[PDB]
Tab-separated table of C-alpha atoms in Angstrom:
chain	number	residue	atom	x	y	z
Y	1	UNK	CA	-44.111	45.376	3.556
Y	2	UNK	CA	-41.670	46.802	6.143
Y	3	UNK	CA	-43.308	50.293	5.531
Y	4	UNK	CA	-46.869	48.959	6.350
Y	5	UNK	CA	-45.174	47.192	9.313
Y	6	UNK	CA	-43.835	50.370	11.023
Y	7	UNK	CA	-47.477	51.768	11.152
Y	8	UNK	CA	-48.983	48.503	12.250
Y	9	UNK	CA	-46.528	48.435	15.077
Y	10	UNK	CA	-47.572	51.967	16.357
Y	11	UNK	CA	-51.357	51.606	16.213
Y	12	UNK	CA	-52.167	47.953	16.984
Y	13	UNK	CA	-53.655	48.170	20.527
Y	14	UNK	CA	-55.213	51.019	22.493
Y	15	UNK	CA	-53.232	54.277	22.126
Y	16	UNK	CA	-53.656	57.144	24.701
Y	17	UNK	CA	-54.526	60.571	23.085
Y	18	UNK	CA	-54.075	64.173	24.209
Y	19	UNK	CA	-55.615	67.162	22.349
Y	20	UNK	CA	-54.786	70.844	23.051
Y	21	UNK	CA	-56.511	73.710	21.295
Y	22	UNK	CA	-55.836	77.434	21.456
Y	23	UNK	CA	-58.772	79.375	19.985
Y	24	UNK	CA	-59.613	82.935	18.989
Y	25	UNK	CA	-62.961	83.533	17.166
Y	26	UNK	CA	-63.789	87.274	16.538
Y	27	UNK	CA	-61.483	87.961	19.543
Y	28	UNK	CA	-63.345	85.600	21.812
Y	29	UNK	CA	-60.352	83.641	23.200
Y	30	UNK	CA	-60.571	80.149	24.566
Y	31	UNK	CA	-58.565	76.949	25.240
Y	32	UNK	CA	-59.659	73.341	25.160
Y	33	UNK	CA	-57.945	70.194	26.470
Y	34	UNK	CA	-59.002	66.681	25.478
Y	35	UNK	CA	-57.985	63.205	26.698
Y	36	UNK	CA	-58.997	59.747	25.502
Y	37	UNK	CA	-57.848	56.828	23.510
Y	38	UNK	CA	-57.981	55.340	20.025
Y	39	UNK	CA	-58.057	51.745	18.776
Y	40	UNK	CA	-57.457	51.990	15.023
Y	41	UNK	CA	-58.008	48.183	14.704
Y	42	UNK	CA	-61.696	49.106	15.240
Y	43	UNK	CA	-61.557	52.671	13.723
Y	44	UNK	CA	-62.611	53.686	17.268
Y	45	UNK	CA	-61.933	57.021	19.178
Y	46	UNK	CA	-63.198	57.986	22.652
Y	47	UNK	CA	-62.388	61.570	23.815
Y	48	UNK	CA	-63.480	64.052	26.423
Y	49	UNK	CA	-62.833	67.768	25.864
Y	50	UNK	CA	-62.937	70.496	28.494
Y	51	UNK	CA	-63.048	74.243	28.027
Y	52	UNK	CA	-60.372	75.223	30.551
Y	53	UNK	CA	-60.945	78.998	30.033
Y	54	UNK	CA	-64.661	78.811	31.089
Y	55	UNK	CA	-67.591	78.990	28.623
Y	56	UNK	CA	-66.875	77.866	25.056
Y	57	UNK	CA	-67.875	80.910	22.903
Y	58	UNK	CA	-68.864	78.675	19.995
Y	59	UNK	CA	-70.989	75.459	19.716
Y	60	UNK	CA	-69.089	72.256	20.537
Y	61	UNK	CA	-70.409	70.566	17.346
Y	62	UNK	CA	-68.443	73.228	15.278
Y	63	UNK	CA	-65.107	71.909	16.736
Y	64	UNK	CA	-65.639	68.148	16.207
Y	65	UNK	CA	-63.779	67.974	12.841
Y	66	UNK	CA	-60.905	70.040	14.229
Y	67	UNK	CA	-60.558	67.882	17.335
Y	68	UNK	CA	-57.189	62.113	14.355
Y	69	UNK	CA	-57.357	60.353	10.947
Y	70	UNK	CA	-54.447	58.106	11.890
Y	71	UNK	CA	-57.080	56.174	13.963
Y	72	UNK	CA	-59.123	55.293	10.819
Y	73	UNK	CA	-59.640	51.540	10.323
Y	74	UNK	CA	-58.014	50.824	6.887
Y	75	UNK	CA	-59.243	47.443	5.560
Y	76	UNK	CA	-56.461	44.953	4.791
Y	77	UNK	CA	-56.841	45.492	0.933
Y	78	UNK	CA	-56.298	49.251	1.448
Y	79	UNK	CA	-53.234	49.386	3.854
Y	80	UNK	CA	-51.038	50.746	1.023
Y	81	UNK	CA	-53.290	53.893	1.012
Y	82	UNK	CA	-52.967	54.866	4.704
Y	83	UNK	CA	-51.057	58.141	4.543
Y	84	UNK	CA	-51.808	59.000	8.171
Y	85	UNK	CA	-50.086	56.080	9.824
Y	86	UNK	CA	-47.278	56.126	7.254
Y	87	UNK	CA	-46.201	59.629	8.522
Y	88	UNK	CA	-45.814	58.424	12.133
Y	89	UNK	CA	-44.211	58.715	14.615
Y	90	UNK	CA	-42.823	62.015	13.238
Y	91	UNK	CA	-46.436	62.994	12.485
Y	92	UNK	CA	-48.140	65.281	10.126
Y	93	UNK	CA	-49.517	68.819	9.818
Y	94	UNK	CA	-53.331	69.094	9.256
Y	95	UNK	CA	-54.475	72.564	7.971
Y	96	UNK	CA	-58.063	73.588	7.306
Y	97	UNK	CA	-60.192	76.479	6.220
Y	98	UNK	CA	-63.832	75.816	7.179
Y	99	UNK	CA	-66.406	78.138	5.678
Y	100	UNK	CA	-69.641	78.507	7.581
Y	101	UNK	CA	-72.288	79.381	4.843
Y	102	UNK	CA	-73.628	82.999	5.464
Y	103	UNK	CA	-71.300	83.376	8.383
Y	104	UNK	CA	-67.567	83.380	9.432
Y	105	UNK	CA	-64.713	81.006	8.830
Y	106	UNK	CA	-62.251	78.930	10.913
Y	107	UNK	CA	-58.646	78.519	9.884
Y	108	UNK	CA	-56.885	75.711	11.758
Y	109	UNK	CA	-53.345	74.433	11.923
Y	110	UNK	CA	-52.600	71.239	13.779
Y	111	UNK	CA	-49.674	68.961	14.379
Y	112	UNK	CA	-50.427	65.339	14.930
Y	113	UNK	CA	-47.609	63.203	16.307
Y	114	UNK	CA	-46.335	60.852	19.042
Y	115	UNK	CA	-44.891	62.207	22.257
Y	116	UNK	CA	-43.685	58.971	23.709
Y	117	UNK	CA	-46.474	56.422	23.740
Y	118	UNK	CA	-49.080	59.260	23.532
Y	119	UNK	CA	-50.622	60.436	20.332
Y	120	UNK	CA	-50.900	64.267	20.502
Y	121	UNK	CA	-53.038	66.717	18.359
Y	122	UNK	CA	-51.869	70.322	19.006
Y	123	UNK	CA	-54.110	72.835	17.378
Y	124	UNK	CA	-54.399	76.644	16.825
Y	125	UNK	CA	-57.773	77.914	15.591
Y	126	UNK	CA	-58.565	81.448	14.311
Y	127	UNK	CA	-62.169	82.439	13.387
Y	128	UNK	CA	-63.000	85.695	11.592
Y	129	UNK	CA	-66.103	87.423	10.092
Y	130	UNK	CA	-68.663	85.797	12.320
Y	131	UNK	CA	-72.083	87.379	13.105
Y	132	UNK	CA	-72.200	88.011	16.877
Y	133	UNK	CA	-75.861	86.921	16.666
Y	134	UNK	CA	-75.573	84.169	14.051
Y	135	UNK	CA	-75.796	80.420	14.434
Y	136	UNK	CA	-72.221	80.079	15.742
Y	137	UNK	CA	-71.607	83.153	18.105
Y	138	UNK	CA	-75.418	82.979	18.845
Y	139	UNK	CA	-75.207	79.286	19.842
Y	140	UNK	CA	-78.171	78.121	17.722
Y	141	UNK	CA	-76.677	74.726	16.720
Y	142	UNK	CA	-78.152	71.506	18.078
Y	143	UNK	CA	-75.897	69.197	20.212
Y	144	UNK	CA	-75.783	66.272	17.747
Y	145	UNK	CA	-73.893	65.272	14.690
Y	146	UNK	CA	-74.569	63.609	11.291
Y	147	UNK	CA	-72.599	60.829	9.464
Y	148	UNK	CA	-70.414	61.937	6.609
Y	149	UNK	CA	-67.979	60.499	3.987
Y	150	UNK	CA	-64.709	62.490	3.644
Y	151	UNK	CA	-62.904	62.190	0.251
Y	152	UNK	CA	-59.122	61.945	0.360
Y	153	UNK	CA	-56.902	62.581	-2.643
Y	154	UNK	CA	-53.128	62.717	-3.180
Y	155	UNK	CA	-51.360	66.087	-3.346
Y	156	UNK	CA	-48.218	64.693	-5.069
Y	157	UNK	CA	-46.564	68.129	-5.497
Y	158	UNK	CA	-46.676	68.684	-1.729
Y	159	UNK	CA	-45.833	65.116	-0.732
Y	160	UNK	CA	-49.200	64.959	1.099
Y	161	UNK	CA	-52.977	64.760	0.744
Y	162	UNK	CA	-55.969	67.166	0.187
Y	163	UNK	CA	-59.366	66.413	1.735
Y	164	UNK	CA	-62.599	68.283	0.720
Y	165	UNK	CA	-66.009	67.843	2.419
Y	166	UNK	CA	-69.249	69.355	3.699
Y	167	UNK	CA	-70.598	69.041	7.254
Y	168	UNK	CA	-74.311	70.082	7.834
Y	169	UNK	CA	-74.928	71.067	11.469
Y	170	UNK	CA	-78.598	70.967	12.593
Y	171	UNK	CA	-79.894	74.399	13.696
Y	172	UNK	CA	-82.447	74.597	16.532
Y	173	UNK	CA	-85.227	75.892	14.178
Y	174	UNK	CA	-84.990	72.675	12.117
Y	175	UNK	CA	-82.788	74.052	9.322
Y	176	UNK	CA	-79.024	73.320	8.662
Y	177	UNK	CA	-75.819	75.330	8.868
Y	178	UNK	CA	-73.336	74.206	6.112
Y	179	UNK	CA	-69.703	74.052	7.007
Y	180	UNK	CA	-67.562	73.571	3.906
Y	181	UNK	CA	-64.161	72.104	4.859
Y	182	UNK	CA	-60.946	72.453	2.836
Y	183	UNK	CA	-58.051	70.459	4.112
Y	184	UNK	CA	-54.338	69.733	3.383
Y	185	UNK	CA	-51.958	67.305	5.303
Y	186	UNK	CA	-48.192	67.182	4.978
Y	187	UNK	CA	-45.764	64.903	6.860
Y	188	UNK	CA	-43.565	66.575	9.485
Y	189	UNK	CA	-40.557	64.199	8.653
Y	190	UNK	CA	-38.293	63.898	5.562
Y	191	UNK	CA	-38.934	60.174	5.166
Y	192	UNK	CA	-41.149	58.337	2.607
Y	193	UNK	CA	-44.942	58.324	3.104
Y	194	UNK	CA	-47.820	56.362	1.585
Y	195	UNK	CA	-49.625	58.568	-0.977
Y	196	UNK	CA	-53.086	57.207	-1.521
Y	197	UNK	CA	-55.322	56.489	-4.456
Y	198	UNK	CA	-58.659	58.467	-4.205
Y	199	UNK	CA	-60.752	56.920	-1.423
Y	200	UNK	CA	-62.868	58.110	1.384
Y	201	UNK	CA	-63.246	57.786	5.148
Y	202	UNK	CA	-66.761	57.120	6.609
Y	203	UNK	CA	-67.367	58.969	9.852
Y	204	UNK	CA	-69.943	58.448	12.545
Y	205	UNK	CA	-69.834	60.756	15.553
Y	206	UNK	CA	-71.832	60.808	18.763
Y	207	UNK	CA	-71.680	63.718	21.176
Y	208	UNK	CA	-72.612	63.289	24.864
Y	209	UNK	CA	-72.182	64.925	28.317
Y	210	UNK	CA	-70.329	63.524	31.420
Y	211	UNK	CA	-73.004	63.615	34.164
Y	212	UNK	CA	-70.344	64.381	36.828
Y	213	UNK	CA	-68.702	67.160	34.884
Y	214	UNK	CA	-69.545	70.815	35.794
Y	215	UNK	CA	-67.090	72.432	33.410
Y	216	UNK	CA	-68.129	73.257	29.831
Y	217	UNK	CA	-67.228	70.082	27.858
Y	218	UNK	CA	-67.940	67.502	25.116
Y	219	UNK	CA	-67.659	63.679	25.169
Y	220	UNK	CA	-67.014	62.485	21.591
Y	221	UNK	CA	-67.264	58.867	20.287
Y	222	UNK	CA	-66.127	58.391	16.655
Y	223	UNK	CA	-65.917	55.371	14.328
Y	224	UNK	CA	-63.963	55.883	11.185
Y	225	UNK	CA	-63.469	53.357	8.321
Y	226	UNK	CA	-61.620	53.772	5.012
Y	227	UNK	CA	-63.453	52.551	1.896
Y	228	UNK	CA	-63.914	53.272	-1.845
Y	229	UNK	CA	-61.103	51.131	-3.284
Y	230	UNK	CA	-62.470	47.624	-3.914
């Protein structure tokens, strides 16, 4: 399929990644840079993010979803359903509203595309209605992360996809902070794109610290595999 081919040819080996985020949550401004690499053959991403404005005013775990579904491993039987690669290299726009239960919300807009050989995720994040002393602005979320399926459906009217899902972040007192994600992706280009049957992506995410890093940062290892169409 010369359409499946054009995506295979962009993602087959290890692809360098750059992430840039401009943030404003309740007027706490911040910027984050990330660098790393993905190997979609293995559904594998390795990234390190640095708060370049100083202290991150929110918990790192709250940013993990915002900080590359083109790096999903799509099994051979499901290649016709890989919207994310099909949009490249022109890329796509990824928009979210994430609702933190009993607290504020994030609205994100990102553009995911190639700049040369480098896959780039440029993001703007605005958070509003947070409790200065809640789980988020009060930094009461544990530095860990649970596995989660993410359900993708076509959005035929918008030539794109919609993704709906819940993340539960562990709170330090043993409870959980729900973060209900609503998501829409649309290709940046005018060309044809693969619009998928309903399926899901399985995520596992592991958060760590670089022992030689003094700046405020997050090391993120993700494995992501499409499934749900036998």
